[PDB]
Amino acid sequence: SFTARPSSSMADFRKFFAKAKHIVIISGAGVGGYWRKWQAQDLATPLAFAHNPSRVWEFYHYRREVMGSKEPNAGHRAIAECETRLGKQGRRVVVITQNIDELHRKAGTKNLLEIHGSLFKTRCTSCGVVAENYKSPICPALSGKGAPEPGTQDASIPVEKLPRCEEAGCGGLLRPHVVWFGENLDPAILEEVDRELAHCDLCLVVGTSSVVYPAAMFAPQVAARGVPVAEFNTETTPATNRFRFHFQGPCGTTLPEALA
């Protein structure tokens, strides 16, 4: 149990990167946090939804509005373009994202695993159907709601006027198709994650990536197998010292360099 610190040698990393046949890129929020008086993690829970579906929908309406307008940043683009370029060489890049904003998709990434769902899908709490939804606003009663300042008045929308299911004989209440804290991730998605992690020969962990479980154990699983992991993050994390490399800085700076 040597005091193992990660390398910051970019040239050594790029040596691995030139040879790698299957690169797994794990990403997080760099793309709690607070909306009004609440920690984001405390809205993103089925108990918040069961007990105040209006407050949760006002929050996800906000998130949909804010994120729906965002363009991909230099990190997303570099990751997308690295996938295309390596693709033409018979080399695999896959992104496993903890994010729900779809910005990897907007940047053109094709091999993408969204492990916590999407702002832009709903699921019906009655019949269970999942559907895409980019409609702004998602229902009329949320029009102009969702403002983030502490002190902003609650909408208090009656449940009947919240987003509703359009399937025949249904009209049930919709929720965001987002995996919430205390909910299980999709078992089929976790088995696919396992297969990518077991076969990759290089893993990057970006934006980080290391405080939401089980996703937080993904890169360390890869390193515990002896495969190199490079972490790109503005600060160090509880997992850093498990990895082969650590590149500090905003990843709109480092990632483009590392992936070039």
Partner: peptide, 6 residues
């Protein structure tokens, strides 16, 4: 283990 948490 499959259960999302912080």
């Amino acid at each position: 283990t499959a259960r999302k948490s912080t």
